[PDB]
Design a protein around this ligand. Sequence first.
Ligand SMILES: C#CCCCC(=O)Nc1ccc(C(=O)c2ccc(NC(=O)CCCCCCC(=O)NO)cc2)cc1
Ligand SMILES: [K+]
Ligand SMILES: [K+]
Ligand SMILES: [Zn+2]
Length: 358
Amino acid sequence: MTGTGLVYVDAFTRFHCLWDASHPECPARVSTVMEMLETEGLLGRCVQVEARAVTEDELLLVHTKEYVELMKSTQNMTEEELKTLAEKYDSVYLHPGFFSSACLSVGSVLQLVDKVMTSQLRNGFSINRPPGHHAQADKMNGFCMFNNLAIAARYAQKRHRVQRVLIVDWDVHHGQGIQYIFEEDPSVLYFSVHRYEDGSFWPHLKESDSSSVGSGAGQGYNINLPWNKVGMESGDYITAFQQLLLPVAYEFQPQLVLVAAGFDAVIGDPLGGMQVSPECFSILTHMLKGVAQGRLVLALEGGYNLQSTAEGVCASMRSLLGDPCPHLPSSGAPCESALKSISKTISDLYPFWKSLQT
Ligand SMILES: C#CCCCC(=O)Nc1ccc(C(=O)c2ccc(NC(=O)CCCCCCC(=O)NO)cc2)cc1
Ligand SMILES: [K+]
Ligand SMILES: [K+]
Ligand SMILES: [Zn+2]
């Protein structure tokens, strides 16, 4: 059970925003990542895995046949028809090749799920766009068309008999799509740390607060860690993982870990406003390898500084390949605002996880 998978196809670069040449979700995001992985010698050390289109059967695991057909109906629309449909969604652009690339974006994750759950690879990383963690059952959202990881979690449960999936969302934006799809599901534990600022940061939702601990059977299986001050650094995330996610992770005992690996919380991102060094994601990735026998699959979400995102992917890739953890320039001590958000989240999840009762 050795090797690290890497999935990248040029179709990820064959769709862009037609009415805005400076849109941050651009093909240069994934192309700059591949360049740095090659120049740093990391790309050659990975087992290249080919992608595949997601079937209508797999897409229907979280979406509706109506919405899937409308998204399929977008490849034959004109630009005026793409723009009038996109305007019906929140923060979304469309393109005749968008739907095609989105299908390869979803299947790229499932390809790694196959190889990892069959012990052919130890872990994997898909360098894919469009992102996915905002896509919902019958609508696009936040540059996403289809929910890559939410599909992959249900796919692994059905195709590979997995009972417990852990989804770690370290993107700077709350993945409200994944939270909605699994709001009552106790078999898919969704953790999200994100910028919130009491709701003044997009998507400006109260459901992104720590008090949305899931409902019904999934009561306690949705953990939101909302930041409320910008400038969070590596010590805030390390403390967050060590005192909140990892204790709940070992108690949950998942058989597969899927990471919404966005990098808009890295230094210099135009949107995240956070101060996390890229080397920190070598530490966060390393922590996640002690869970689920290291069955770890990462998929690109956000990250819009071309240099910051590529550095984050590279730092994550070094941990996947087993390279030594890096020296972190930032202080391992968290800030007071982070401890307040960590404390409040521990309180909202205290009655559901014995590892937090302290
Ligand atoms: C050196 C030096 C200077 C560098 C400074 C710089 O260039 N700043 C800068 C700022 C803005 C832009 C945008 O064009 C732009 C437009 C619209 C939006 N929409 C939204 O925010 C609301 C919803 C967003 C979905 C997020 C998806 C996601 O990530 N899910 O994980 C965002 C950005 C480009 C550059
Ligand atoms: K997040
Ligand atoms: K859940
Ligand atoms: Zn994001």
